[PDB]
């Protein structure tokens, strides 16, 4: 409005809000659709759900490849949003029991899920990079606020999705049976609206063209660099001062520098999948911990499941608080948070949150009697301090990661680094699946283990981040 902020980001944040609303509304009812409409096995339903989630996490690589290597962005966003809408149409069409049965439903649902995953993986990184591209490189301070607002929009969409989804599938009869078509069609309409609002701002955007087949050039440059050193029976100057310097007979310096920055950022990001896996193991164990503690709260009775909604709400509170107060207060003094100290502090906060969870579990275990009621039975409170610490860690880490990925990426591959950021989440989610089956430790001894692991990862990332060479 006033200055320093383009009007375009309005139809970026709004589009992201609508897209997250639709995605979460659909994913909430996906499992019930599998179990009570398709009548699938529990194993089959869970496996298909996890496969869909993994494909959603892994498709942004393909999306970013398309965007940066060809077609630019705002054209991959538009086309992948069209694919997303087609997938939603197929999915909602497979929930209609009138046409076909048990074969058309399955095929249509699976095809729609595949298309939805393709769309999400390619609307995720491209949208963030495109929104960040609206600011001049000099306006590096408004970009951080834009990214904070972007994360706020994502979390708000998730929260309204949680608050609105149960109404759609509450005692509604599509055709004599439970109405899943509405549950899958409302997200489709939301995605259509998101695409419409994003396209409405076409004439205001700052569409930059791609810099050529950047992915192919990067792959070829790395291949030549690696293959040049193979001087088994010779060698005087294979490569010195770097492993890319003597990949210089081709691939001019402006490309070697870009691939250098990409490799540096990837090496920095190497350990983030472990952090994601460790931090993800809190939405399931903390529910079990809540199940063992009183939840009357005097005024309103709180169920253990309902406590999960406290994360997005605390994120919504913290993002403005961190952006407008805490960071400003820190900047008041000479203390300098370099966007890499923020991530380390977030890791430390997550470790502290898990240590507090272990302490609360230890307090829970120490219960002795005086329907008998244990005197040392904690209320659902005492879970706030760990929800506060873990939420602050997510705000400091996730919001800073989006800005760091964009700020440290070459202009030719801005959205590739955003796929690298999401790639860590995809790998971390894979680690969770592999580790989920292995569970034979006490809750208190498991939390203390996660706290120690989160500390080891923080030290590894902190040391590597200390030697990181910023892009310039």
């Amino acid at each position: 409005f006033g200055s320093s902020y383009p009007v375009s980001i309005a139809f970026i944040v709004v589009n992201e809000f609508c897209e997250r609303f639709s995605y979460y509304g659909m994913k909430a009812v996906l499992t019930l659709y599998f179990l009570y409409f398709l009548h699938w096995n529990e194993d089959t339903s869970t496996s298909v759900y996890h496969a869909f989630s993994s494909l959603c996490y892994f498709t942004p690589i393909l999306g970013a490849a398309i965007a940066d290597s060809w077609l630019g962005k705002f054209k991959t966003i538009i086309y992948l949003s069209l694919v997303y809408v087609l997938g939603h149409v197929f999915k909602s069409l497979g929930a209609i029991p009138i046409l076909g049965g048990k074969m058309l439903h399955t095929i249509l649902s699976l095809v729609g899920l595949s298309l939805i995953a393709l769309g999400t993986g390619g609307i995720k990184p491209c949208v963030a990079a495109f929104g960040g591209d609206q600011f001049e490189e000099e306006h590096a301070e408004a970009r951080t606020r834009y990214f904070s607002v972007f994360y706020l929009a994502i979390n708000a969409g998730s929260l309204i999705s949680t608050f609105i989804t149960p109404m759609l599938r509450g005692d509604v009869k599509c055709f004599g049976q439970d109405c899943y078509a509405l549950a899958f069609g409302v997200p489709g309409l939301l995605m259509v609206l998101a695409l419409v609002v994003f396209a409405m701002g076409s004439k205001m955007y700052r569409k930059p063209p791609p810099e050529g087949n950047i992915v192919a050039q990067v792959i070829k440059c790395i291949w030549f660099a690696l293959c040049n050193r193979f001087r088994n029976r010779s060698g005087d100057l294979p490569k010195r001062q770097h492993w890319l310097d003597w990949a210089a007979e081709k691939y001019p310096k402006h490309l070697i520098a870009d691939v250098k920055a990409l490799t540096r950022v990837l090496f920095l990001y190497i350990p983030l999948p472990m952090f994601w896996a460790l931090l993800d193991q809190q939405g399931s164990r903390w529910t079990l911990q809540a199940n063992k503690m009183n939840g009357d709260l005097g005024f309103f009775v709180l169920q253990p499941d309902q406590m999960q909604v406290l994360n997005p709400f605390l994120v919504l509170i913290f993002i403005p608080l961190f952006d407008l107060v805490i960071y400003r207060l820190i900047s008041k003094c000479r203390i300098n948070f370099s966007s890499l100290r923020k991530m380390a502090v977030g890791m430390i906060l997550a470790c502290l949150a898990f240590a507090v969870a272990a302490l609360v579990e230890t307090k829970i275990n120490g219960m002795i009697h005086p329907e008998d009621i244990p005197v040392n039975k904690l209320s659902i409170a005492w879970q706030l301090p760990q929800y506060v610490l873990v939420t602050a860690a997510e705000v400091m880490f996730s919001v800073t990661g989006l800005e760091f990925s964009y700020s440290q990426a070459p202009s030719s591959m801005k959205s590739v680094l955003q796929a690298a950021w999401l790639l860590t989440v995809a790998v971390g989610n894979i680690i969770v699946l592999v580790v989920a089956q292995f569970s034979g430790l006490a809750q208190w001894a498991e939390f203390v283990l996660f706290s120690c692991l989160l500390l080891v990862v923080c030290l590894i990332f902190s040391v590597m981040a200390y030697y990181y060479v910023p892009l310039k």
Partner: nanobody, 123 residues
Framework: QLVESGGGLVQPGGSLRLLCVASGRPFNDYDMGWFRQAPGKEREFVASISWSGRVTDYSDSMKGRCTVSRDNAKGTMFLQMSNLVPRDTAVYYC????????????????????WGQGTQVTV
């Protein structure tokens, strides 16, 4: 494997509690379901309980209100029928399906592989 059943006559509006004990491999491995076969009719679906009992399903009719529960220790499964009527005076079967990946409906006869002998609950 080697599923069994137990039940008998019930009052016009009474209730019944049918058993199903597996005398083979571990009970936590198999998905279980209940079927009924009224005289001169086709085998119908009654209720289904998944391995670990997390997921439960009942037929649209579910005359009165059924409730299927299972414990994986001792391998026993219970069906609680509440508001039985003169109808549904059928022979109730127990079906077990070993866990695997399939696209066949869990509420169909084809999903299950081993059927025990059926009781003769009558009204």
């Amino acid at each position: 494997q080697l599923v069994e059943s137990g039940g008998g006559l019930v009052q016009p509006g009474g209730s019944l509690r049918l058993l199903c004990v597996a005398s083979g491999r571990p009970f936590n491995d198999y998905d279980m379901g209940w079927f009924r076969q009224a005289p001169g009719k086709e085998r119908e679906f009654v209720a289904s309980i998944s391995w670990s009992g997390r997921v439960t399903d009942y037929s649209d009719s579910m005359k009165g209100r059924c409730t299927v529960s299972r414990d994986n220790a001792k391998g026993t499964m219970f069906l609680q029928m509440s508001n039985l009527v003169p109808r549904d005076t059928a022979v109730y079967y127990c079906a077990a399906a070993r866990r695997r990946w399939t696209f066949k409906a869990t509420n169909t006869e084809e999903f299950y592989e081993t059927w025990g002998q059926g009781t003769q609950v009558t009204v």
